[PDB]
Amino acid sequence: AVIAFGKFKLNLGTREMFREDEPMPLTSGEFAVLKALVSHPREPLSRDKLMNLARGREYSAMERSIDVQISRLRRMVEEDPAHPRYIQTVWGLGYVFVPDGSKA
Numbered sequence: 001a002v003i004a005f006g007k008f009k010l011n012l013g014t015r016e017m018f019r020e021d022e023p024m025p026l027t028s029g030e031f032a033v034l035k036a037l038v039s040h041p042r043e044p045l046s047r048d049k050l051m052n053l054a055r056g057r058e059y060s061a062m063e064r065s066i067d068v069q070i071s072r073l074r075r076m077v078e079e080d081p082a083h084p085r086y087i088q089t090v091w092g093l094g095y096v097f098v099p100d101g102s103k104a
Helices: 028-039 047-054 067-077
Strands: 008-010 016-019 022-025
Touching: 008 067, 028 047, 028 067
Parallel strands: none
Antiparallel strands: 008 016, 016 022
């Protein structure tokens, strides 16, 4: 279902994410993008497959952005876009989502 954290809060079903209360809109592209990652936990996929997955039917076949999107996504989830937690960007791979942390 939705994805909430100790402080952060996210929900695809409602497409509403916030941290502590700060309401943040997640456009199709964004949500779809993240959703993709939230669709496959611990699954490293290339930047292409990233937007690709998000690029299904809904209006997500135009906003070709992942590096800029992810970065922004890594922020909302992690105030500090340097030391994330549920976002493990791999240059070799692409973008993996390891919740809590186990093995990149």
